[PDB]
Structure formats: C-alpha cells, structure tokens
C-alpha cells in the first residue's frame, strides 16, 4: 500500500536531488536564481528547472552562462519545467 | 552522465507502472477509459492520472466505480494530472 | 563519487525492508526467531533470509509453518543467506 | 508479488553495473582480470570485486595499480567480495 508508493516518492525525490547536485547549473530566471539541468544530460537551449523556488514563463528572461536568453517554450519532464531558450 | 540519468529516468518510468498495476482502477474520463489511483495509496474524490492517452480537463464527467464525477480542478503529482473529482 | 554510492545503498536497504515487510514470514532457526521470504516470491522449501540477527548453518533445525526442517545448503542471494530446507 | 521483487531485482542489477562503470578499476587477481572498485567509494588496501568471472581466495595475489598485493581477508558486501589487500 502506502509504505510501497511511499518508498518510490522518496527514491524519486531523491534521484532528482542526485542529478541536480551533479549536472545542476546555476542560472537567473526572471530575477530569482535557481538550478537548472542542460538537456542534454537527461535525454535554441533546452534545460528542465530543478529548483521548485521558481515558476518559469514564457517571456521570461533567462540568464544563463553569461548570456541572456528568453524562454520561447514551456513543456513538461517528469513534471518538471522544460524550458525552451532563445538568445537575445 | 546520461547512464545515471537514463537509469534514474527508467526506473521511474517502472516504478509507476508498478503502482498503476497494483492499485489501479480503470476509469472512464471524457468518453476515454483509462487508469487511475487513489490518492488514498499515494500520499470530493482525488486520484491521479496513470494513463498517457488522456488529457483531463475541468468540466469532464468521469464514471468512477459505477458514479459520475466532474473533474472540479487539476493539479500535477509527479507530473502527472492529480484531479479533484465531485459526484453529480 | 560516495553521493551516488550512499544513494544506492539506502535504496537497496529500503528495498530489501519492503519485500521482507511485504513477504516475510517469522520462522525459527536452530533457537532464533527471525524473518524469512520463500523463494517462490523472488526467483525440498527454499528461502532466503533477511534478519541480521541470525547466521544459519547446515545442520539447523527451521521450525516453518508449524513443520520441522533441516537446513542441507545454503547459497547466496544478492550477499543474502538462502537455505535449502528438507522435512524431518 | 514477484513483480516488485522482479523489478527490485533488476535495479539492483543496474545499480551495481553502474557503479562498477563509473568508479571501476581493471584489476588481476590470481591470473584473471577483473574489476573492482576501491571501498573509499562506497563506505592496507580495500575493494570490493564486481565483475561475476572470479572467485578470490585468501592467498591470491592481486596486481592493482602495477603493484602486487595479497588477499588477507574476505567479507562480504551486499552479497560481494570484499577484499582486504597488503603490498608485497
């Protein structure tokens, strides 16, 4: 019951901590900065938001390994923000 | 790099196929029959959506256990649709 | 580096709580009681055991389900005693 | 049933295999090669031996790292021989 669904929400949670601690940038999105994994990792830049301190939008300036970018895209991974990024 | 996070991505894709299978019930939502689980296993009806061939919606009748529901909001879990459901 | 290792090792550890929890049977071993899951869930009784509390040994009387055996191998699964029982 | 007990298995299996792929190391014991990974990774030389092709003993010499070594003791980790090996 429980005890099984619970076991794989705390084995997901922390697979998803695991990832970010390792691959995690750091990166400013419509001025508050937050963690964010490069697509490419998990598979025009395209990276899914780890951080759940952030609502990313659609116009949203991004600000990510110096450059500024602005967020064309919104899709879903694994319930996380996969944003699509277009430079400025 | 991709291995652990190809591993992690498909470990999570059979962990939730495992909870659909054991505490799944199947359900008609929007005149499409798919599978749900009770919220009551994983954390005004709530369950969340399993099947990928639906795309519930507020306003949607859903026959659940013999009853018709109205999806009345939507949140995510785990990215998946998390619907509050109300009888008729 | 440890972080990925230490993950692993709680999820087999968690892992292994949830089978015995779920499987488990309480048997007693030449005086010991401890938990037992039959193969039959995992794959002349077999079974592996997982209390940490015991260390069985070929010769051991196993009272199971009311019935007396005797311990005649024992094999490894995945580090785990699993012992080869025959009736008395 | 056997399905999360199946399923535990094989991360398990993936677990492992993934461990040995990233921390790893080529090593011959007792005229076969292998790999192993250094205990500093998952806790008067300490490994433990993934590769399933050999049987280390007590006495074996070990070439590891272009020095020789020899098994003074073996445990046991998560179902692995773990060696304890000194210079020669």
């Given at each position: 019951?429980?005890?099984?669904?619970?076991?794989?929400?705390?084995?997901?949670?922390?697979?998803?901590?695991?990832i970010?601690?390792?691959?995690?940038?750091?990166?400013?999105?419509?001025?508050?900065?937050?963690?964010?994994?490069?697509?490419?990792?998990?598979?025009?830049?395209?990276?899914?938001?780890?951080?759940?301190?952030?609502?990313?939008?659609?116009?949203?300036?991004?600000?990510?390994?110096?450059?500024?970018?602005?967020?064309?895209?919104?899709?879903?991974?694994?319930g996380?923000?996969?944003?699509?990024?277009?430079?400025?």
């Open positions: 019951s429980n005890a099984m669904a619970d076991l794989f929400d705390g084995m997901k949670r922390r697979m998803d901590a695991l970010a601690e390792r691959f995690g940038m750091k990166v400013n999105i419509n001025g508050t900065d937050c963690i964010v994994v490069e697509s490419d990792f998990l598979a025009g830049k395209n990276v899914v938001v780890f951080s759940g301190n952030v609502i990313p939008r659609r116009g949203d300036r991004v600000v990510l390994r110096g450059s500024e970018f602005t967020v064309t895209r919104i899709r879903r991974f694994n996380k923000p996969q944003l699509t990024l277009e430079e400025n």
